Design a protein around this ligand. Structure first.
Ligand SMILES: CNC(=S)NC1CCCCC1
Length: 284
């Protein structure tokens, strides 16, 4: 079926939970043996969210190459994404090592450091220009260059230096700051505006390594971001945009990381975002 009318048909019939459970039943199951090794327990935020072995990002280190991060490679859309958990106190250095080694331009953050009165990820970037951060375990230096605070999101320019080679690179930090503590946003308008700002920066384009996207677990809000982006790109590429099947795209993405889209409300919100986003692209 088309999307917008499949949408109204699920609303009128109140069957979002049944649709979402079908997706969960059909989703791929692949091994994640490296994630479950005992030496990696303090590298995982949640015991039930792990990268598959076949698609995990490897750190360029011979001691321990493990990070909770997956490469989502979308062949028809010609986009790649790295989805990862929010960094932990003992993985902030690994996180920036990955950004460096994978040649990423942008980092997309969809959570606040504290939500619901608890810490959802480490304070992993500097908050003042004159107070830079040094990660001694991976030999990297990170400096805040500039910060632009808007009503729904903040964009930061950061300098990452490989202290071993003295090479430097500019990294863009795109921080969506207004996702509600419970539920999903009422309108997708500010999320779409944010997605378009990431796009306009070059961070999603083939001349750079894959964008790094995270929330707390790296599957829920993060899944919504890449699902909406890929679906809108396919609607632009194809002769028949109504042929884009969001459930099929989501199942393809779940071949590369488990659990993408965590609730039926997140599924409905993803439909809403793609539907509204397709009108703004045109032709309008
Ligand atoms: C309408 N069908 C679609 S969009 N099928 C898939 C979606 C994910 C990747 C390949 C095409």
């Amino acid at each position: 079926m088309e999307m917008e009318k499949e949408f109204e048909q699920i609303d009128k019939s109140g069957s979002w939970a049944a649709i979402y459970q079908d997706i969960r039943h059909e989703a791929s199951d692949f091994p994640s043996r490296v994630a479950k090794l005992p030496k990696n327990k303090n590298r995982n935020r949640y015991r039930d969210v792990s990268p598959f072995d076949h698609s995990r990002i490897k750190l360029h280190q011979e001691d321990n190459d493990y990070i909770n991060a997956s490469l989502i490679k979308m062949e028809e859309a010609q986009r790649s994404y790295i989805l990862t958990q929010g960094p932990l106190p003992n993985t902030v250095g690994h996180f920036w090592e990955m950004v460096w080694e994978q040649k990423s331009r942008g980092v997309v953050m969809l959570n606040r450091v504290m939500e619901k009165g608890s810490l959802k990820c480490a304070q992993y970037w500097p908050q003042k220009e004159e107070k830079e951060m040094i990660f001694e375990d991976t030999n990297l230096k990170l400096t805040l260059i500039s910060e632009d605070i808007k009503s729904y999101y903040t964009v930061r320019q950061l300098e990452l230096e490989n202290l071993t080679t003295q090479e430097t690179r500019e990294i863009l930090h795109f921080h969506y700051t207004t996702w509600p503590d419970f539920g999903v946003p009422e309108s997708p308008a500010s999320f779409l505006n944010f997605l378009f700002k990431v796009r306009e920066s070059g961070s999603l384009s083939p001349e750079h390594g894959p964008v790094v996207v995270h929330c707390s677990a790296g599957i829920g809000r993060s899944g919504t971001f890449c699902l909406a982006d890929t679906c809108l790109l396919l609607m632009d590429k194809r002769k028949d945009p109504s042929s884009v099947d969001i459930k099929k795209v989501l199942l393809e993405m779940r071949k590369f990381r488990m659990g993408l889209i965590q609730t039926a409300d997140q599924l409905r919100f993803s439909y809403l975002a793609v539907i509204e986003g397709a009108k703004f692209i045109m032709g309008d």
